[PDB]
Amino acid sequence: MMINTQEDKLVSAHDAEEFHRFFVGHDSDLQQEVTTLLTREAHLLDIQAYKAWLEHFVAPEIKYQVISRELRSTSERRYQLNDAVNLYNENYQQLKVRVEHQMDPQNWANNPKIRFTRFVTNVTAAKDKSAPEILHVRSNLILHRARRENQVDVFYATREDKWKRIEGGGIKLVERFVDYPERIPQTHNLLVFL
Amino acid sequence: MMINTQEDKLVSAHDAEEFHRFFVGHDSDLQQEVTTLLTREAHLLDIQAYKAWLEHFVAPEIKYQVISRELRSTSERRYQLNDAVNLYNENYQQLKVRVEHQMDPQNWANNPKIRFTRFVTNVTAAKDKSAPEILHVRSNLILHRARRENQVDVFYATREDKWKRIEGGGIKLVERFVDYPERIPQTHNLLVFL
Amino acid sequence: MMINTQEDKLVSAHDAEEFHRFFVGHDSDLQQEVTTLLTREAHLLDIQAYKAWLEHFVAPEIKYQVISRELRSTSERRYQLNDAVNLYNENYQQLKVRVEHQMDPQNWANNPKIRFTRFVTNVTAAKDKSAPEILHVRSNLILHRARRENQVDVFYATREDKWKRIEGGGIKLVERFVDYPERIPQTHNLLVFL
Amino acid sequence: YQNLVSEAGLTQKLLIHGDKELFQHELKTIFARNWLFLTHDSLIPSPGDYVKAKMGVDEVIVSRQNDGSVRAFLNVCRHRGKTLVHAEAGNAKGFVCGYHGWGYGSNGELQSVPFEKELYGDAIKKKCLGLKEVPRIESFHGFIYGCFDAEAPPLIDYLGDAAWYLEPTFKYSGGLELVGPPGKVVVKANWKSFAENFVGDGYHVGWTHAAALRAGQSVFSSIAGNAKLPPEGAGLQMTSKYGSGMGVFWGYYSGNFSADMIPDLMAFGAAKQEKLAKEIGDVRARIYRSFLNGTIFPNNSFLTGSAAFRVWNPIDENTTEVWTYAFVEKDMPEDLKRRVADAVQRSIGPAGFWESDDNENMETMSQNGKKYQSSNIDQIASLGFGKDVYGDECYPGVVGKSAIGETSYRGFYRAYQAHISSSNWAEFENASRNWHI
Amino acid sequence: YQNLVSEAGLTQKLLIHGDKELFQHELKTIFARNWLFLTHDSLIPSPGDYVKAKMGVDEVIVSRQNDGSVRAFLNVCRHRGKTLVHAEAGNAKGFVCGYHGWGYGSNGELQSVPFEKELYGDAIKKKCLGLKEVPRIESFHGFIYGCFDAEAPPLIDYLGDAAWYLEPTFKYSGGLELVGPPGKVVVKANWKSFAENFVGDGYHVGWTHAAALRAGQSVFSSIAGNAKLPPEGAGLQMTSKYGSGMGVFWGYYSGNFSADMIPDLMAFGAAKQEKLAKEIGDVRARIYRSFLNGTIFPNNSFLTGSAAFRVWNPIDENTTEVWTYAFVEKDMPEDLKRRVADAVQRSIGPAGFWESDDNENMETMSQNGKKYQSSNIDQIASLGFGKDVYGDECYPGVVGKSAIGETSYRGFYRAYQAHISSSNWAEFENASRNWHI
Amino acid sequence: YQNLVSEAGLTQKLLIHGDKELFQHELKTIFARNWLFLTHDSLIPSPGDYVKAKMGVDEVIVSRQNDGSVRAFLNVCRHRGKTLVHAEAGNAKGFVCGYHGWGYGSNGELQSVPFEKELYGDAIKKKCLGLKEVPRIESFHGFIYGCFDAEAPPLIDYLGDAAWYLEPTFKYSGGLELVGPPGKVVVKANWKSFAENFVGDGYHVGWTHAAALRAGQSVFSSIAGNAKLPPEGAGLQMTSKYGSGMGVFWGYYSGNFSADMIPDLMAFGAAKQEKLAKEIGDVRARIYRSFLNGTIFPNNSFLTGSAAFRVWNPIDENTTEVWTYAFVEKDMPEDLKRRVADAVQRSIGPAGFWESDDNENMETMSQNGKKYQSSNIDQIASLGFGKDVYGDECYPGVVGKSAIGETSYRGFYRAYQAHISSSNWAEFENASRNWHI
C-alpha cells in the first residue's frame, strides 16, 4: 500500500516511503522478536543500567540523534538555512561520556535516585532489503521521569532505529533518530535516553 | 467468563456483554492481525496521510462517532432527555469534507505543520458470530498533538470498532464509536481523528 | 544477559537479578498468554467490574501492595528507619472491603459515574523456576481517571506480579507490588486499582 | 477602568483580553449585574427537572418547580459551603448535601437536618438557611435568563431593539427547542474574544474559514477570500442600548452547514417563509430564513439558520469554558432535527471544523493582551463607521448596511465600557443616555 | 481582614477558603507566629539523624545534635540561596551545598568554604553565614514543634486546656512512636478545610462515610446515616485559648479501622485502661481508650485510637500537601504496630478509602470560596451553640456535651480571626482576653 | 523596589528571584528600556528573511529589508490584535493576517485590506495602521539588538568597557556566524538566576560540574573540586557601567567541550592567535583563544571558546524559555563548524549534560525566593570584594584578578538596582554617576 503525495498534501515524500517500507516489510516472527528486544532495552534503561545498555545494546558505530526542528511555513521554500538542531548527535565515545556522568557519585542531580518508567508501543519492523542483518525499527515511547517529590516530566517520541544482528545472536543499535515533536519541551531538560 | 450485574453494581448491561464478547472471542491469530492493522492505521494518521486513510482504511458505509455524555446521577432514572452529544457522527462524505479541509493550503491552523504521535494499546478483537467478515475491535489510544512551540494536548480514548474484510484481503472500518471520557476536554478542541 | 553492579553504579542488586530473571525467562507462548490475561484484567477494571475482578482474577492468598518510598541519599547508609509506607497492603478481606465501598449506592464520590481508561504496555513474563504454576509478570500501566467535568488524573506505574495457574485453566493474582514512582502524587488521591 | 474603549466604541485596548485585575472587576460589574443565559424550557420540561448552569464563575441549579415556574440557586450548601449537586442535569424533588446530610427542596428550602431534634433544637432556624437564590429569572420565548442584580431592567427591555430581529425565528416560527446536551470544551481565550466575533464578525468568514468553505460548500462560499460581497446584498448589522447586537446575511438559512444539509433545510425554510409573510410581512419573513449572527450581552451568542446557541463561560482572563447547543424549530421533522443537532457540532462544536479555525484568532488575541508592550496596541472597530443610522422606518436600533461591518462591535464595547465604569444600573443608565447619538 | 469570622466564631465567610491575598497574609500572621509540627523523637533518634519538614511554605532541616538536642534550619544556602538538602530523611554530620561547595555542620555552622584561603581571606566571616535557624524548638512527649516567632508562648502553655485531654494517650500510656515515612499527596483544598474537619467534625462521619462504615464495620457504624447518637453517649468536644480543640467519642479505641482490627486493638486498650485507672483515675483511663479527633492549631491534626497524625502543609490558597503518619504505643507488640501503621493508610492515607470520601467535601468548599457570588456565603458553626461551659469540675477548657458538635470549630476560628487581625503575640493576647466568656 | 540590592551590589534579597510584582515591574523598567538580543546577520542573510524573537515577554518579527537594513515589529495585527506570524523563521516579502486578511509588507506597512474599496473607503487610513515598530535596532559585529526605548544609549556605548574584551573574538577574528536553529527549553527558574551564573560564576564549575569534568575531561578539569586554581593563573573578571560583565580563564579555548574536541580546536585557535598577535598584540591575541563567560545586560549570555550564545527569555517570575545557539568563526573548516554546533548542545543545550547539573541550582534558588521566610535571606556576592580596580593600564572597566570571583555579579546587580529604582534613562544615569567608585 502506497500514499499518493500529490493528493495527500500533508505527507512528506520521506514519510510516505517509510510508511510503504514498514507496510510491505511486515513479518510476524520479526514483530515478536523486535517487541521483545525493545521491551528488554526499555527495562534496562528504566533500572538505570546504562553501562549494560551501552555495552550490550549499542553498536560501536552508533549514531544516536535527537533533533529539534525549527517551525517553518509550509509555503516558505526560499529560506534554506539548517532547520534542525541536534539535541543529541552522539557516537559511542560521546555516549560513554554521558553514561560516566550518569553514574558518577558526584552527579548531584541523581541524588536522591530518579525514577524512570518507559512505555513502548506501536512497534513495527522491517528487514533491510540490501543488508539483511539490518533491521529497521519504528516504535513510539512515553517516558515518565519523577524526582524530588513533585517533579514529573513526560516525554513523547517516535524512535526511528536501525539495529544490527551480531555473531552469537545479539542485536545492537546502530542508529536511533528522533524528530522530537515538541519544539520547546516544558520538561526542564531532555536529559533522558529516548 | 461473565459479570453478574446484580452484584457488580457499577457495571452496565452493555459493558458486561461486551466484556463477555471479547473474552470468548479471543483468537491468537486474530490478535496479531488486528494489532498490525491498528498500528498501520495509527502510523498513517500520524504522518497525516488522511486521503490514504479515508480511501484505504475506511469503508463507504462508515459511521464515525465520538460522543460526549452528559453527567447524570446514577440514581436519577426519571430524566430521559438525550444524554449524549455527537462531537463526531460522520458518514463518508462528511469525513471527505473534513479531510479536504485538512489538506487545503489555506487551512491556517495547519501552518506550521502540526505533530501527531499515537499510542495504541490493549487491543482485543472478536469475529462477529453472525457476520464472520465483521471484526469487532476494541483498543485504547493516547494521542499527543504538539504545535506552535509550546502547545501540547493529550487525548485518551477507547475505540469501539467494527471492521470489515474486503475482497482482495484488505480490512476497512465500518464503525468507530468513542465515548469520550472527559466531559469537558481541556485541549482547546477535539479536532483529531481518534 | 547480566548486569555488573560494580560498574553499573545506579542499579540495585534487586533490579539486576529481576532483569536477568525476565531475560532468561522469555517464552513466546507465555508472552501472548500473559498479554491476554492483563488486557482482560484491565478491561474488567475499566468497566468497574470490581466484584468479578476480585472473584475471578484475585487469589484468596493475595497480597496487594503499593508503596511510597521515602527519598533517601544514595550515600546515606547509616539511617536505617523504614523507608516505605504502604499505600495499599491488602489481603483478600481488605480488598473485599474496598470493593464493597466501591459499589455502595451511598458512595457519594462515585456519582456521577467515574471514567477509567487503562493502558498496559511492556509486558514480560517468566515461569518460576521452583513453582512452575507461578508466573512472574512485569507490566507498565498508565491509568487515566476522569470525573466531575474537568478532573483528570493520570497514574504511571510498574506492576510486579505473581500469578498462579488454577485447576480448570484460570489464572489468579497472588501478589502485586508497585513501588509508586512519584513520592507526592498530584492526583488528589491514589484510590485506584493499579 | 476608564478609557479602555474610545467614544463610539471605535477602539479597544488589547489589554482588555488579558488583564487579570480587569477580569476580577468584570465579575463585579458585568457578571453580577447583567442577564445571563441559563437554559431553555425544553431542557427542564417537567416538575423536578434541573440543569446546572454557570452565571459568570458561579454555578447555579436551575429547577422546574411543582407549580410550573423556574427558580435558580447557587450550588452551595448553607452549612459548610460544599457544592450541593454534581450531576449536570436530572430530575429530583430535593437535593441532599453529601457532607453532613442537610436536605433541601427543589424550591431551595432547607427541609431536613440530621440530628435536628437531638442536637440542634432551637439552635437552628431552617427558614434562614435556604439556598442562596438568583433573584431575577425571566424568559424570552422559552429561553431562560438569570440575573444576580434585583435592579436590572426586565429581560425584554434589556434585549431592546435586538428583540425585533430575533422574533421571526424565536417568536413567530411556532416555537423552538434547545437540543442538549451541549458540547463543552475549554479554550485559552478571553470570553470577550468570542463575544465580539459572534456579535458582528461577518468579515472573518471568507478569510479564516476559506478552507472550510471550499470543503463543505456552505452558502457562505459567496464571500470566500473576501473577494466579493454576497449577491443578495451586503446585509445588515445592528446594535442596541444594552449591548446586544447582530448581523443579517439575507437568505442564508443553511449558514455554516455543508452542502449535504442545504437542499432539505432551504426547502423547509422557504415553505415556512411563504406562510410567515402573510402574518408578519415580506421583510420579516425573509429575516426568518436569513442567517443572523449575534451576541446577547454579555456572553451568550447565537446563529440562526445554522441554528447554534453558545455560552462563553468565563474561567479566568485567558480561559473560557465554551458551551455549544443546537436549536431546532419544534415543527421540523424529527430526522431533520437530528441532522441539524449533529451539523451544529460538526461546524462549531468541540470537534467542529470551522470552530478549530477560530481557536488561534481568539487565543492569540487574548494572549497578546497579556504581554506588556502588545497590550497597549488598540483594536480598531471602524468598519462602517460614520454610516450607521438610528430611527430607520423599517429597521430599528443603530443599524449599518453590511453584515460585514463593526456596527455591533462598537455597540458591544460601548455597553461594556459603560458597565465597567459604573457601580450600578442607575449609573449605567446615566452613562448610556446618548447611546444612539 | 476583620469580620471574616463572627463573634464566638459562629460564622465564617466562605471566601477564607479561596482568597489569594488572605493566604499571603496567613503566611505572615498564622505560619510566621504559631507552633508548627516538625517530627517525633523516634524519627530522628540518633545523633546526625535529620528529617526535612515544612513550616508553612518554607522548608527546614530538623537535625539531632551530637549533645542529644534538636535544632532546625531553613533549607537554604547562605551563599546564593540554593536548596541545601534534597533527601527527606537521613543521617549526616554536615550538609554540603551542591552549587559551589559550602559545607555546613549539622549545627548549622558554616564550616568549609572552597577557596577560602586562596580567594576569600578576610573577605569572609563564616560565623555570620550559618544557616538561618528556627529560634524556638520544643516538644510535647516526643512530638517536636518549631516556631519562627521568638515571642511565642511555651508549647505547653500554647496547648492550654487541650493538653489535659491529650495526656492519657500521649503522656501516661508509656510513650508513643511516630511511624514513618508519612503518606504524602496533594489535594486541591485550602489547609483550613482539613483543619476544621479534624478539629470537630463528628457530624460528617455517619453521612460522608456511610458506605465505608457499611463496608468495614468500624465501631462508628453506630452513627451511620446520622440516625442515632452513640449508645455510649454523645461524647464531648472542647476548645482552648490558642485554638486547639478536639472531640471525644467514648470507648472507640479502634476508630476508623475495619472489623479485622477491632478485637486485638480493643483487647490491648482495655488491658492498659485497667492499669491506668489506678494511676490517673477512671475517667482519664477511659479517655486513653476513646477516640479523640482534633487539631493542634493551626495545621496539625490527629486521631487517637485509630492512631493518626496529620499535617496540612499549605502550598497555596487552593492547594495542600497532606502528610499522614501513624503512631503507636511503644509497648504494643511489633506485629500490632505494623498492622496499625498499615490500617491508618488504609483509611486515611493517599489511597485511604475513608479519606477519598472527604476529598470532594474539602475541595469544593475551597473552590466555592474562590467564586465571586459564592464566596460571600457564610459557613455556620452553630452546633452546640449556647450550651458550652467553662470551668467544669472534671473537664477543663470550653466544653460541649457532644463530639457531634461545633464547639471546637468556634474556638479554632476565634483564634484564627484573632491572629489575622493581630501584628504580634501581644496583640493576639489582647484580642483573646475574654476568649472563654 | 529600593534596597533589594545593597551598595556595591554586595548582597541581593533572595525574593528578587521569586516575586511576582517585581517581575511585572521588570517588564516596565528592565525589558522596556534595555538592549535585547534579536538575531545575527547570518540568520537573516537575504532580503525578506525573517526570524521571530522575544523582547522580554513580547514577540517581534525581525526582517531583512530590500535595502539590506533590518527592521523589527511587534508580532500583532493592528486590526483585532491576532498574532501575525507563527513560523519561527522564513522568507517573505509580506505577512498576511489569517483572521480577516490584512496584508503587511516586510517593512511593516499595511498594504492590502480586503473590501477596502467596497466597505472601508475613507474610513481607513492604512498609513496609520502599520505594525508597531521597535524604534531602535543596532548591531555589534553582526549581532543585532533591539530596544523599545528611543532614549537608550547607542549599543556600543551600552557595552561600555565590555566591548574591549569581546573584540578579539567578535571583531578581530574575521567574522562570526551564529548557527541556528537554537535549542529551546523551558526551565522553572527566574531569568536572573541564569544571568548571574553566566556573568561571573567561575566558582561553580569545579563543584557543580565535578562529574561532567571527570567524564568529558574538559580543560576545566584543572579546577575540579574547587581544590586548585588554574595553572595558567586565576584569570580576570570585569564589569561595566550598564551592567554587562564577564570572566576570563586564560587559554581555555575548548571551554566546556570534551576531550574529543580539544586537539582540533586548540590547534585552530593557536594558529589564529599567532596571526592576531601581530595585529592586536600578545595579551589581546591570548584573550581571543581564552574562555570568556559573560552576560550582556540584561538577559543575553555567552561563552567564548566553547562558543555559545544564550537568551534567557522571561515567561514569569519562576519560568524562563532558554535559547541556546552555537557560534563559529567564519573561516573555520565546515566540518569543524558542525562539530562545534553539536558540541555546544551536548554540554549546555536542552539535552546538555552540563546544563542538566545547573537546573537545580537555578530552579531552587528561584523557588526559595517565592517562600515567605526564605525570601528574606540575602544572597552574598562578596568574592573579590575590596580588591577590584578601575583604570588599569591594560584591562579596562572595573576589574578583579580572578575569573572565580563575584566582581561581575556586583556590577550586574548594581545596574539592575539602578534600573528598577529609575523611571527612565536619565534617572538611571544619575543613579550610576559613581558606578566605578
Ligand SMILES: Cc1cccc([N+](=O)[O-])c1
Ligand atoms: C458571521 C459569523 C460569526 C460567527 C460565526 C459564524 N459562523 O460560524 O458561521 C459566522
Ligand SMILES: Cc1cccc([N+](=O)[O-])c1
Ligand atoms: C470525627 C472525625 C474527624 C475527622 C476524621 C475522622 N475519621 O476519619 O475517623 C473522624
Ligand SMILES: Cc1cccc([N+](=O)[O-])c1
Ligand atoms: C564560568 C562558566 C559560567 C557559566 C557556564 C560555564 N560553562 O558551562 O562552561 C562556565
Ligand code: FES
Ligand atoms: S456542608 Fe452541607 S450538610 Fe454540612
Ligand code: FES
Ligand atoms: S549557593 Fe550554596 S555554595 Fe554557593
Ligand code: FES
Ligand atoms: S485581526 Fe488581523 S486582519 Fe483582522
Ligand SMILES: [Fe+3]
Ligand atoms: Fe469563525
Ligand SMILES: [Fe+3]
Ligand atoms: Fe472524613
Ligand SMILES: [Fe+3]
Ligand atoms: Fe554550569
Ligand code: NI
Ligand atoms: Ni524517518
Ligand code: NI
Ligand atoms: Ni556486561
Ligand code: NI
Ligand atoms: Ni460499547
Ligand code: NI
Ligand atoms: Ni491510494
Ligand code: NI
Ligand atoms: Ni522488584
Ligand code: NI
Ligand atoms: Ni462471577
